[PDB]
Design an enzyme around this catalytic site. Structure first.
Site, PDB file in Angstrom:
ATOM      1  N   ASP C 106      -6.818   3.196  -0.256  1.00  0.00           N
ATOM      2  CA  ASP C 106      -7.724   1.984  -0.175  1.00  0.00           C
ATOM      3  C   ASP C 106      -8.882   2.375  -1.273  1.00  0.00           C
ATOM      4  OD1 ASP C 106      -6.316   1.028   2.347  1.00  0.00           O
ATOM      5  OD2 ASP C 106      -8.005   0.556   3.278  1.00  0.00           O
ATOM      6  N   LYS C 166      -9.106  -5.706  -0.414  1.00  0.00           N
ATOM      7  CA  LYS C 166      -9.810  -5.445   1.165  1.00  0.00           C
ATOM      8  C   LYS C 166     -11.231  -6.013   1.149  1.00  0.00           C
ATOM      9  CE  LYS C 166     -11.136  -1.563   3.827  1.00  0.00           C
ATOM     10  NZ  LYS C 166     -10.740   0.146   4.096  1.00  0.00           N
ATOM     11  N   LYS C 196      -7.011  -7.398   3.591  1.00  0.00           N
ATOM     12  CA  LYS C 196      -7.385  -6.443   4.732  1.00  0.00           C
ATOM     13  C   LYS C 196      -8.726  -6.813   5.129  1.00  0.00           C
ATOM     14  CE  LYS C 196      -7.905  -1.772   6.154  1.00  0.00           C
ATOM     15  NZ  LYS C 196      -7.308  -0.389   5.935  1.00  0.00           N
TER      16      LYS C 196
END
Lengths: 234, 234, 234, 234
Positions: C106, C166, C196
């Site tokens: 991430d 994300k 996400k």
């Protein structure tokens, strides 16, 4: 110390705007900060005589040329603000910044690993730092720990060779308040370590109270306003 | 004023815990407050020598007996905290508390109707308060208005015969900070009116700073902590 | 989409607790997190069948052994949360975690340097991640940018070969809300990229709403509570 | 109820924007509210078909003429938001509003005095209200009490003759969330009492979740935005 004690101590130490300015590490550590903002930060640091400019690693490198030209000391944060990248990663990060001319590092160690790990980690960074004659400030996120734990942290920093201990990252905690500053200072000063207060310092008043509480250096992203606020309340 | 100015002015006025305790309007204005809590408030007010106990109309009435017995002056809030019930309602409310022995009223006028309306409305309660030899403090919610508008409200309060002007309700705004206090004081003092700071005053330092900025009276729901905090930072 | 649309879409996608648990990236990214906490995170991830465990580089490495034993996929944050360390530093950080067995990253790029810079930077880590068959999720801090700028960032992420985008770090912004999720999803899905949502997801309802708005994966530091909250409101 | 239960229930009850609009008590209870804002509130209530306009006593009276002309039902808050003025003061306040044409009262009783006092107080207000054929909603500040205490409060309201129970003042607590709404509804509905949710309801989504949780009426100072947000997320 009493309330009067902290106010009087602040007044004893900050007689002029220049006194205050000299203790301020003008900071910019925002996800929105652009190269232009960074240039403005450094120019203004020279303009108002702030202690130094505090930046992220990338901007420290990108602005080093201008900072050198204007005689503005550069301070870079390391492993900031969460501090949970491995020691090797922080050293590569510190290296690139040191090679660029940064003479101070505001380090966030992996605090949650405990006093011994912090000692071993900080020692490694101080080692690299000393070879460049750079000063290391260790951020301890004081508001997160009790006094016993803060003491252990201050002691590990001391044993590691660190010069200064910092109250907060300003992200996960805020440590610009008198209480938090005193908690750190009452432990650091007896050991001969400097003290940096940061987190929410927005007014000249905030700055004076932090110094009166024991802070030697004032970290703030509102340096100009803090200084102007010091000269005139409104 | 400079940051140094307000600090020094605070130190000059508050030499002892007694000086501070004497300027503190110990307050309890919570939806959770019980009769027991109110008894404790009044008893500790006596213990610490606080200026008075500030309560809602109902508790002012219920505690009047105890207050008289312990020699604690009672102050009731009126039309608090929104202040948008008609004058008639506010007058009935004030009348009941005055009948019970309250000697001060912290009134919230219908500010948003304008300076002229505030003048007429406050003139009304002041007239009533005067028949009981009671003091009236007018809450102006200073943080909501610019200097021109605040001046208009201060002037209306003066014209209406009010004794003191209060910075905030502590609900819709917080006016315990030096800037807000000075904004009000700079306008009210030249007119001979007293100034009360309220809203977020939790520390002895907050108290000293507010007094330094021009507050004659300190309103706080943490009277005991402010006092103890005054004596010892931690 | 209408409010009804997102609710219905959420209900259509999350029929069982298992469906939800399967989309949850159980996270622990706190300065207070201890090794013990991390072991608990990974063990409960196994217990509840969460999608994976998201950790900082150091803990990803320390827990890799346990994770492998319990069959828990590991995801490490990179350059988190500020993302302003140079690419070189981020690459070393990613390399170490990839060497330990992490299959997802991430990543927080240096967003404020612009779309082009983000493209080059992400292209770099994606290249590295690919050699390990690892998935890359690019954190774009959506709440900070307007639609035009977010589109530029989404496009750069796509061009760089990233799999997922994300919404937030959960630190400098919070992007678990339906509006933020839709803003990102409306741009990313048409391009075949996953989405996400992270930041403030505390309830089962928060989770269902985020999925209804287009989130494929749910990032949360309260995985267990979100799941239990999904089954029972109180 | 499960998360799915609350979402589905909300969808079952709010099929159209008109359904939502009909349940919204468009509110304005700000210290900054002017007569102009109030006029706009009432006009828009008619424009969008909101259930009614909720105002402070003074504005309820001042706007009654226009409200009657446009056929906008008026609801006034009483002893709002602290509720600690004596019963007699609240009756005079309710009287002036009832005489003006207000057909609903959102009352804040002196909750901290206990269930029995609330019963005696609410009965007195319901008595005056019934003579005008007015409906009474009793604000219980649910987030402040445990279930046992909330039940006692709901029961005192029931015994007092009240029609509806409200979750919060939106000042001292916020009760627009599903959890708080369900806590109140699970107690009120079995007794045949209506339920009003208020506090932080800003989106169409917020509104739908509150209804799904059991709210019959939605109190909000952002009625127009809630409605528009219901129709389109962005």
């Amino acid at each position: 110390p009493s309330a009067r004690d902290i106010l009087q101590q602040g007044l004893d130490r900050l007689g002029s705007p220049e006194d205050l300015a000299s203790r301020i590490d003008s900071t910019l550590l925002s996800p929105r900060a652009t190269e232009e903002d960074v240039r403005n930060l450094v120019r203004e640091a020279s303009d108002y005589g702030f202690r130094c400019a505090v930046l992220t690693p990338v901007y420290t490198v990108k602005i080093s040329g201008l900072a050198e030209k204007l005689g503005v000391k550069l301070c870079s944060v390391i492993g900031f603000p969460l501090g949970q990248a491995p020691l090797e990663v922080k050293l590569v990060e510190a290296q690139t910044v040191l090679e660029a001319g940064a003479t101070e590092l505001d380090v966030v160690p992996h605090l949650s690993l405990g006093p011994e790990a912090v000692y071993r980690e900080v020692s490694g960074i101080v080692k690299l730092a000393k070879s460049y004659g750079a000063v290391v400030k260790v951020i301890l996120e004081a508001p997160l720990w009790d006094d016993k734990t803060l003491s252990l942290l201050v002691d590990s920093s001391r044993r590691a060779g660190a010069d200064i201990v910092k109250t907060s990252t300003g992200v996960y905690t805020k440590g610009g308040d008198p209480v938090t500053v005193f908690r750190l200072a009452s432990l650091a000063k007896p050991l001969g370590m400097g003290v940096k207060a940061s987190g929410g310092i927005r007014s000249g008043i905030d700055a004076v109270l932090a110094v009166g509480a024991g802070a030697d250096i004032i970290g703030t992203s509102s340096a100009v306003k803090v200084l102007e606020s010091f000269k005139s309340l409104v």
